Amino acid sequence: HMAHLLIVNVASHGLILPTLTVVTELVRRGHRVSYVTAGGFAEPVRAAGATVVPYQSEIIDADAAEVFGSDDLGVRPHLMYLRENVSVLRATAEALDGDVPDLVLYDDFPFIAGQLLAARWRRPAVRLSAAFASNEHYSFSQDMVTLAGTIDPLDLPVFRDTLRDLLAEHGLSRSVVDCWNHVEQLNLVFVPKAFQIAGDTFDDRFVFVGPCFDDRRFLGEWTRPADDLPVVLVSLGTTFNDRPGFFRDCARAFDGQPWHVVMTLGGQVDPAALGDLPPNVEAHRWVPHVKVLEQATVCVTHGGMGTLMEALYWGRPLVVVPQSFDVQPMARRVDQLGLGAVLPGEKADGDTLLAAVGAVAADPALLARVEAMRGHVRRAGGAARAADAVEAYLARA
Numbered sequence: 001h002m003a004h005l006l007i008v009n010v011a012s013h014g015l016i017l018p019t020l021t022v023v024t025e026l027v028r029r030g031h032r033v034s035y036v037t038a039g040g041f042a043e044p045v046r047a048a049g050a051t052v053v054p055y056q057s058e059i060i061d062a063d064a065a066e067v068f069g070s071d072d073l074g075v076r077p078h079l080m081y082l083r084e085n086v087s088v089l090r091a092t093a094e095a096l097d098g099d100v101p102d103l104v105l106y107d108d109f110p111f112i113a114g115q116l117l118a119a120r121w122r123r124p125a126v127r128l129s130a131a132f133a134s135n136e137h138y139s140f141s142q143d144m145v146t147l148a149g150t151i152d153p154l155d156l157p158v159f160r161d162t163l164r165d166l167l168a169e170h171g172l173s174r175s176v177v178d179c180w181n182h183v184e185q186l187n188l189v190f191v192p193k194a195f196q197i198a199g200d201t202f203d204d205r206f207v208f209v210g211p212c213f214d215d216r217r218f219l220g221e222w223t224r225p226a227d228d229l230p231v232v233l234v235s236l237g238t239t240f241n242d243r244p245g246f247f248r249d250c251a252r253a254f255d256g257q258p259w260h261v262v263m264t265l266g267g268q269v270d271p272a273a274l275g276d277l278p279p280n281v282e283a284h285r286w287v288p289h290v291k292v293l294e295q296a297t298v299c300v301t302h303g304g305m306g307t308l309m310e311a312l313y314w315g316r317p318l319v320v321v322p323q324s325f326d327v328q329p330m331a332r333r334v335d336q337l338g339l340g341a342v343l344p345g346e347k348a349d350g351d352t353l354l355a356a357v358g359a360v361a362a363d364p365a366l367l368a369r370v371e372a373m374r375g376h377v378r379r380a381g382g383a384a385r386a387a388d389a390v391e392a393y394l395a396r397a
């Protein structure tokens with residue numbers, strides 16, 4: 001049974017955090033795990049039991065708002081995406097050509113490097129999805145392309161040509177379009193099937209294990225106040241979070257109000273830049289959302305899948321304030337399932353947020369649906385089921 005498992009991934013919070021417990025459970029079962037990452041993420045990855053395979057990352061330093069704002073076609077993001085994939089591919093082949101893994105597990109983002117390594121080494125592969133899974137019916141990629149307003153990457157000759165030669169030099173007998181729309185034989189999705197868009201269309205190639213998490217001390221620590229105010233998490237995530245005005249207006253509206261607000265900035269905005277905060281309002285660069293959500297009454301989030309799932313794991317009603325294309329599908333789905341109030345873009349000013357937080361906290365119908373979804377999240381199976389699926393896949397392969 002014992003195997004050398006490689007996890008191909010890139011330098012991003014949302015993509016890495018869900019995988020940590022899974023790494024640990026596998027190491028516990030006596031498997032060896034190599035994990036591709038960069039920079040500061042190396043530390044938590046090792047602590048989870050994995051051997052780190054460093055690659056030079058471009059996204060880890062990038063500002064997504066700026067990248068997608070650079071040109072009006074998205075040429076810059078498209079080509080950065082390829083480079084990040086290529087950087088990952090080269091580093092991993094270098095490190096592991098001599099220590100070839102039995103299984104290649106790759107996140108959605110580096111799926112090109114994922115397929116290429118699996119083919120180069122003649123190994124089975126597993127795709128990991130930290131957001132919505134994609135199949136022949138629903139494509140999360142297309143959804144994001146359309147919502148982002150960029151050109152279709154395959155309508156970009158230079159992108160298409162690069163990818164083409166990349167497959168060519170690697171002898172992969174697969175066309176660009178088929179490579180791009182490749183559905184792997186096994187998929188681990190960190191979402192409950194009930195939340196997945198078009199969930200019922202997903203067959204046995206997909207295992208919906210939902211979220212799985214530790215205390216995540218590496219994100220700092222947190223304890224609720226010694227008072228009786230209901231706690232409210234407020235976060236714009238880690239990606240499109242350069243929004244001082246938003247956090248300031250939030251603190252202002254909640255000033256003197258019957259809530260305790262915990263705001264997380266995600267490494268972008270400086271807490272000081274907010275000015276003086278009401279006594280019932282905290283501001284941090286980082287605190288574990290799981291620890292706040294355990295004590296929380298309401299979760300205000302832009303719609304990052306991690307935060308949504310950590311929130312629904314505790315059955316907290318939602319106020320989703322999407323400020324960008326990458327979370328529009330998550331927010332749309334929460335709205336569809338009636339799991340919270342959605343305040344898109346400009347709508348999410350402080351006063352509107354104050355009312356929404358109050359509304360969802362006291363909506364009995366909404367609360368029922370949130371408690372039911374919590375159920376689905378709990379049944380998902382998390383890390384243990386992921387590992388079970390992996391080991392069963394190994395047995396077949």
Ligand SMILES: COC(=O)NC1=C2/C(=C\CSSSC)[C@](O)(C#C/C=C\C#C[C@@H]2O[C@@H]2O[C@H](C)[C@@H](NO)[C@H](O)[C@H]2O)CC1=O
Nearest residue numbers: 059062064067077078080081108109144145148150239326
């Ligand atoms: C998972 O599937 C993909 O990543 N798709 C793609 C994305 C692209 C470049 C990314 S890196 S540039 S640094 C900014 C792409 O250039 C183009 C495009 C249009 C929309 C998109 C998305 C994809 O990026 C996504 O960005 C989001 C902001 C991140 N969420 O917060 C996702 O983690 C990440 O995946 C082409 C592409 O294939």
Ligand SMILES: Cc1cn([C@H]2C[C@H](O)[C@@H](COP(=O)(O)OP(=O)(O)O)O2)c(=O)[nH]c1=O
Nearest residue numbers: 014237238239264266286287289304306307
């Ligand atoms: C900003 C922030 C994120 N997180 C976690 C929650 C998620 O699991 C993960 C990803 O952030 P998330 O809120 O999902 O935003 P994004 O769209 O940028 O991924 O990071 C914290 O634990 N504390 C924080 O302060």
